Design a protein around this ligand. Structure first.
Ligand SMILES: Nc1ncnc2c1ncn2[C@@H]1O[C@H](COP(=O)(O)OP(=O)(O)OP(=O)(O)O)[C@@H](O)[C@H]1O
Ligand SMILES: O=P(O)(O)O[C@@H]1[C@H](O)[C@@H](O)[C@@H](OP(=O)(O)O)[C@H](OP(=O)(O)O)[C@H]1O
Ligand SMILES: [Mn+2]
Length: 276
């Protein structure tokens, strides 16, 4: 039905006036991206963007609610890329680090030996360091994506995936998510194949570094299934008509995100699951 229904039953999102719409807090990178995307090959692969509206003296993107077509939708959010932070974050952590004490606590929680003697003494870490560690204990570094969360229309949710890393561990999460619905799985794979084809010819995609974006998988008990790209908050245009291949390894300076390495691996896992 609607994402705000799930928010209620379960805060960067707000109920929209119009049926089948949702409001997301406006950010300049994301607004720029969605405007370009409505004119791009990737138009059909992203939520419809209708413009910006003011609500309580605040800027919101008016988006298609992707859950609107579904009867009690199941949702899985997959963070795409081998890298999950911008290169400019490495620069700022070198010249002027913002010691994040929150990121220290989670890291200790998951691995006590993970922080350095100095990080322990600071009780704090830089964002890039926290983000790189998260990439290595999840599937991000090796497969180029990670499962972030599953939501169900009752209000039910799990984000308990920070150590889901192996190909088989990831397959077992998708196995449990689709619950033996062969039609949903087939529809997911058909949609991902058609998304890969669109990305490989997209003018937007070859000209932009896509960091921190997700693939949202949505299905219901009527076997309806959809996948969309979301979250263009960290998607930045390359300078002077430079382009990325989105498969080759990331080395500081080359701005590569491994986005299609992730999608290739994600398609392979779903095709493997379909043959079980
Ligand atoms: N257009 C949409 N329609 C329906 N649900 C959506 C839509 N966009 C986002 N969502 C829901 O909101 C969640 C968060 O989306 P998104 O990543 O864009 O926001 P964010 O505030 O940047 O979050 P994060 O910091 O986790 O990346 C999605 O995983 C999904 O459950
Ligand atoms: O999921 P987590 O392990 O909790 O980490 C969070 C997650 O990677 C994203 O939500 C990041 O936002 P993004 O950099 O805009 O994508 C958060 O970044 P901050 O807003 O905290 O700086 C980070 O905290
Ligand atoms: Mn985000």
């Amino acid at each position: 039905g609607s994402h705000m229904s799930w928010v209620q039953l379960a805060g960067s999102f707000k109920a929209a006036g119009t049926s089948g719409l949702i409001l997301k807090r406006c950010s300049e990178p994301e607004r720029y991206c969605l405007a370009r995307l409505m004119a791009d090959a990737l138009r059909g692969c992203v939520p419809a963007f209708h413009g910006v509206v003011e609500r309580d003296g605040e800027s919101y993107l008016q988006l298609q609610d992707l859950l609107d077509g579904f009867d009690g939708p199941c949702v899985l959010d997959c963070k795409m890329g081998v890298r999950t932070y911008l290169e400019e974050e490495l620069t700022k952590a070198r010249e002027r680090p913002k010691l994040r004490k929150d990121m220290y606590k989670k890291m200790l929680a998951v691995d006590p030996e993970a922080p350095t003697e100095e990080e322990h003494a600071q009780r704090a870490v830089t964002k890039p360091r926290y983000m790189q560690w998260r990439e290595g204990i999840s599937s991000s570094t090796t497969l180029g994506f990670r499962i972030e969360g599953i939501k169900k229309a009752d209000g039910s949710c799990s984000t308990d995936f920070k150590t889901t890393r192996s190909r088989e561990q990831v397959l077992r999460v998708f196995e449990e998510f689709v619950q033996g619905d062969e039609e949903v799985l087939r529809r997911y794979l058909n949609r991902l194949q058609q998304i890969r084809d669109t990305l490989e010819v997209s003018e937007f995609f070859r000209r932009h570094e896509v960091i921190g974006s997700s693939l949202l998988f949505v299905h219901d008990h009527c076997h309806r299934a959809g996948v969309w790209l979301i979250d263009f908050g960290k998607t930045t245009p390359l300078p002077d008509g430079q382009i990325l291949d989105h498969r080759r390894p990331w080395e500081e300076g080359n701005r590569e995100d491994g986005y299609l390495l992730g999608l290739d691996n994600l398609i392979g896992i779903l095709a493997s699951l379909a043959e079980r």
